[PDB]
Amino acid sequence: FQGPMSNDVAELKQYIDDDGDGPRSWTTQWIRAGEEREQAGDLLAATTFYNMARFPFVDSPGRAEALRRCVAVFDRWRRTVPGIERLELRLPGGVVRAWAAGLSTTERRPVLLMTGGIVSIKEQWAPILPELARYGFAAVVTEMPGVGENELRYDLDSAALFGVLLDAVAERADTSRAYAMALSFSGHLALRAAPSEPRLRGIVTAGAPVAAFFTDKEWQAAVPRVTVDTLARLTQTTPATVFDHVRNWALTPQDLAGVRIPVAYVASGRDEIIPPADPAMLRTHVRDFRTITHDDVHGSPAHFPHTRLWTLAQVLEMSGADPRHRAAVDGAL
């Protein structure tokens, strides 16, 4: 099967009549909205709108166009912002692009590695790079295998990605002290990497899958089609085979006992994608574990203010940030 997904539209909107390619389609409408903001010179709003157009993943000429326009308008915006730099890693399995700020040969700054989940492109987070650098980090924002411009296959070796980002900035940052802000599925990758990657000194995630996601068949049967189809695209499998494909990706009690760094996790109480057994499992087995649960649906979209502040507070603590910066965030939190 090669064509477009024809995503269920109720469900794209939860995150325009249809998911086709006509004048009332999802992609066309988001592109037109994007084009209007771009013409008014509001490049960050255009970035968001082209981003939405390509959501959940590029499966058509129109989504491929939208992704390119997103990257381009963002590139144009960041060109006004001293400090934001593009990194391109040409790798065995394909090319990976990243945006970074706070890099330096004279000061060795701790690394903040940032990634989202399986629908989040790096342009969603890149606009905050200057503010993350302002907290003293070398901040590097990328995206998962198969997402956006990241050309790799999401497979059993994908956890290596963090180390490969650190390799690329080892001359320009204190890469012995890295903190992964790895949201959703990328949080599973961080936790899988951590026991064999001593450069990772802490993890901050939200909604990361752990074990039950990969092994609980009744739960899998009720997961939204958009999540399943995306996973199948990123892994380069199909919907019928994808869960079988990821069955042995579960983190075991020993995997989790092997994570010897602080781990912070924002759980969504009524999460549809991640089973409640997965954060329960982390609470049982991760030694240094910090967590909060919002009584909300997947992504806790009604508590973004709180989540952005809590996660921030957590990474500043883990990296020993300036106490003045910690106390201002603590007050806001």
Side-chain angles (χ1 to χ4, degrees), residues 258-271 273-276:
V259 174
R260 269 105 199 212
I261 50 169
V263 180
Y265 185 116
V266 179
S268 292
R270 315 202 318 280
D271 202 306
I273 319 311
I274 310 310

Side-chain angles (χ1 to χ4, degrees), residues 15-23 25-31 33-34 36-38 40-75 77-78 80-89 91-106 109-155 157-217 219-224 226-247:
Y15 182 88
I16 292 184
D17 290 341
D18 57 277
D19 187 36
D21 68 355
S25 73
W26 169 272
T27 296
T28 300
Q29 280 309 147
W30 288 111
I31 292 173
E36 192 277 306
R37 307 311 319 123
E38 185 173 5
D42 175 350
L43 304 200
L44 288 195
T47 294
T48 306
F49 294 159
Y50 296 144
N51 179 7
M52 289 301 109
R54 151 250 57 108
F55 176 98
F57 73 96
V58 170
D59 70 345
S60 70
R63 282 196 165 79
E65 184 191 341
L67 168 65
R68 175 61 193 156
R69 301 169 65 168
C70 185
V71 170
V73 297
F74 183 80
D75 185 26
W77 179 84
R78 69 94 186 196
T80 71
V81 179
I84 307 190
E85 182 177 334
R86 165 182 269 133
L87 305 179
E88 197 148 337
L89 299 76
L91 284 166
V95 164
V96 179
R97 286 161 152 237
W99 292 108
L103 305 182
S104 188
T105 41
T106 57
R109 298 136 82 74
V111 180
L112 180 64
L113 293 184
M114 190 154 186
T115 58
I118 49 155
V119 295
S120 296
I121 65 163
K122 56 188 185 308
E123 286 83 16
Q124 213 199 311
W125 319 112
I128 60 177
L129 286 166
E131 292 117 272
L132 296 174
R134 247 123 68 70
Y135 285 118
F137 293 107
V140 178
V141 169
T142 187
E143 50 207 350
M144 283 184 67
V147 174
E149 306 184 278
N150 176 334
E151 280 174 10
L152 302 158
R153 187 188 52 191
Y154 183 25
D155 61 26
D157 289 338
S158 286
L161 168 68
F162 309 96
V164 166
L165 293 165
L166 290 168
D167 291 345
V169 297
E171 282 280 303
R172 317 176 57 199
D174 191 357
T175 236
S176 62
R177 304 175 56 213
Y179 305 90
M181 178 87 72
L183 297 63
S184 185
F185 285 75
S186 74
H188 167 262
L189 292 180
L191 289 159
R192 158 78 62 209
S196 37
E197 178 46 85
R199 295 122 101 199
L200 297 174
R201 294 327 308 153
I203 294 170
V204 185
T205 189
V210 181
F213 182 78
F214 297 104
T215 66
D216 178 350
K217 291 295 193 217
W219 180 262
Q220 291 175 357
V223 165
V226 180
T227 298
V228 178
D229 273 333
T230 302
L231 262 196
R233 171 61 59 106
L234 314 178
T235 59
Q236 291 169 33
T237 57
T238 73
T241 59
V242 61
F243 289 123
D244 277 349
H245 185 67
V246 298
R247 67 193 194 279

Side-chain angles (χ1 to χ4, degrees), residues 3-8 10-13 15-23:
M5 294 304 120
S6 307
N7 296 111
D8 183 290
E11 178 182 354
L12 299 177
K13 296 224 237 228
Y15 182 88
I16 292 184
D17 290 341
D18 57 277
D19 187 36
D21 68 355

